[PDB]
Structure formats: C-alpha cells, structure tokens
C-alpha cells in the first residue's frame, strides 16, 4: 500500500499543499467556507498523520501494523477525514443552505452553528469519541484498532460493524439526510436556485454563484464516492471480507483517498476569493461579465460592491 500512498497521497500532498496552505495561508481569514480546511486540516492535513507519518510510515508498511489507535487514518482521520467532510457539507452543500439553512439566523447567524457546528462537530469527535473509543472499548472491536486484529472483530463483529454499520450511521447519514435535509429543500430553493445560487448566490455576502458550482460538485460530492459507496460502504461494511472485503480496499478505500482530493474542493475558494469580485478580468466568476479586484474587506465601497461582487 505504501505506493498507491504515493500514487495518491502523494499526488494528494501537496496539490493537498496548493490547497493545504490554505487554511495555513493566512490561516485565512478562518473560519467561515473555508472552516472546510480548518476541519480538513485536522482531516486532511490528519489524513497526511495519516498518510506521510502513520499512515505511511507506521501506518501500514510503513510499520507495520503497530495497531495504530484506529488504524489510524481509516479510524480516527476518515471519521473526521470523511465524517467531518460529511458534516463539512451538510454544512456547504448547501451552504447554500447556510445562509438561507437557516434563517440566516441573525443576518448573520447562519453562520451557523457551523461555526457553532464546529463545536458541534468535536461535539461528534467527542461523539466518535463515544462509541469509537469505547468502540475499541466495546473490546477488539480493538480489533482493527489496537490488534489491528482480533478477537470479536470478528466473532461478533455483527454487533460491531453492524452497529457502527449502523452506529455512524444511526443517525449520521440518518437525519441529515431527513432534517438536513431541509433545507435541501434549499435545495428546491436550488434546483430553481441556481436562480438562487445566483442572485442570491451571486450575492449573498460571502464567496459565491461559483457558489452553484455548489451542486455540481455537492451532490456529486454526494455522488462521488457516496453513492456507489453508500452502496459499496454500506455493503462494504457489512465488513465480510476474509479475503474479499477487504482486501477490495483499496477500491473500498480508493476513492475516500480520490475523496483526499481537497483541490476541486478549494476552488470552493470560490468561496472566500470569487466574492470579492465584480469586475474586468476573469470568471470564478460572479455575474459574470469580468470579476476581479473589487471587494476586499467591509466588503467595498467600490468598484464591485458592498454585498460584494
Ligand atoms: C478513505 C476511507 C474512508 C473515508 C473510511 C470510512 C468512511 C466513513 C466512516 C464514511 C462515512 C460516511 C457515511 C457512511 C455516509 C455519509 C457520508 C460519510 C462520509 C460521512
């Protein structure tokens, strides 16, 4: 495995590099839209702890096999690595969506709760922390955790995939999906909204009508893995491999690897750098007739202006 690592982890740093500078940038102006590479940095920069230093380097050969702790990157930084993109998108996906998801709380505060979703969401990394670490300690189990082994993964592991399969499901993918959905009936306000994400979409304060780029890529983002995988994740994990899955993983964990790939996922930069724009040259892109250096900060008094662009 150490080189499909590097096929991709290592195409995926650092074009994971000319994307994860940037939350490191600047350190933004961090959070909002781009929260997604201050989750994705403790996700896909942990994806690199992960996939350079453990899991690559003891951390699966490299090691080894140690355990580590999850595996680790698979445990702990594909719950987060993948988890937290979820969540990263119930959140973008619509965010759409946050703003009008909700109630744009306060004019702001649709912020959200994502924002205050962020504490949500070491709210479930406390939250897989819960079962997670007393998934390990629900007891081997610590199986591929600590073993990285055995012995009730698998005599019984029907509770244990079969509750995280489904316990992150139980509800993670449960209402939100059905809450979480809706406003994803922000996305009925989307599908005649991308006359809305594009006006109020481009123009909604922020980074956006590149913003409806939006769903292109958030469902499929919902696709891309997460629906042959909702399919071949679900029944994968199931588990019930012995020899067939895995190993099937990789393919099974190739594209949650093709899903380390933040870079069609920073441009959704997009997103603090399309808005602010209006302007002459170029697209990325917010009206568009050009888009540019306009904006900047307060958001304008000028030239492609004030809920800018
Ligand atoms: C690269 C390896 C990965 C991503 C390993 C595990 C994936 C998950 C625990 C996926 C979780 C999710 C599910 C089941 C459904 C909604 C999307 C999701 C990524 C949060």
């Given amino acids: 495995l150490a080189a499909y690592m590097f096929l991709l982890?290592?195409?995926?740093?650092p074009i994971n590099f000319l994307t994860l500078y940037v939350t490191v940038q600047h350190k933004k102006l961090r959070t909002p839209l781009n929260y997604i590479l201050l989750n994705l940095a403790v996700a896909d920069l942990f994806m690199v702890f992960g996939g350079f230093t453990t899991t690559?380097?003891?951390?699966?050969?490299?090691?080894?096999?140690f355990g580590p702790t999850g595996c680790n990157l698979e445990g702990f930084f594909a719950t987060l690595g993948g988890e937290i993109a979820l969540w990263s998108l119930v959140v973008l996906a619509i965010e759409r969506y946050v703003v009008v998801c909700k109630p744009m709380?306060?004019?702001?505060?649709?912020?959200?709760h994502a924002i205050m979703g962020v504490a949500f969401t070491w709210v479930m990394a406390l939250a897989c922390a819960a079962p997670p670490l007393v998934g390990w300690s629900r007891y081997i189990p610590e199986g591929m955790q600590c073993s990285c082994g055995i012995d009730?993964?698998?005599?019984?592991?029907?509770?244990?995939?079969?509750?995280?399969?489904?316990?992150?499901?139980?509800?993670?993918?449960?209402?939100?999906?059905?809450?979480?959905?809706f406003c994803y009936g922000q996305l009925v306000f989307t599908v005649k909204e991308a006359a809305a994400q594009q006006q109020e979409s481009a123009t909604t304060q922020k980074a956006e009508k590149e913003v409806?780029?939006?769903?292109?890529?958030?469902?499929?983002?919902?696709?891309?893995?997460?629906?042959?995988?909702?399919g071949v994740a679900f029944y994968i994990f199931t588990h019930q491999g012995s020899d067939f899955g895995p190993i099937f993983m990789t393919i099974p964990a190739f594209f949650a690897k093709t899903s380390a790939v933040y870079n069609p996922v920073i441009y959704i930069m997009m997103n603090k750098q399309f808005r602010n724009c209006m302007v002459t040259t170029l697209c990325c892109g917010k009206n568009p007739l050009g888009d540019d250096e306009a904006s900047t900060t307060v958001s304008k008094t000028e030239t492609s202006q004030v809920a800018p662009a």
């Fill in 56 to 65: 690559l380097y003891t951390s699966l050969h490299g090691y080894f096999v």
């Fill in 105 to 112: 709380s306060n004019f702001r505060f649709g912020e959200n």
């Fill in 212 to 230: 409806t780029r939006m769903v292109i890529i958030m469902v499929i983002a919902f696709l891309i893995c997460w629906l042959p995988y909702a």
């Fill in 9 to 13: 982890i290592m195409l995926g740093f």
């Fill in 152 to 181: 009730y993964y698998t005599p019984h592991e029907e509770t244990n995939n079969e509750s995280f399969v489904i316990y992150m499901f139980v509800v993670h993918f449960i209402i939100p999906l059905i809450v979480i959905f």
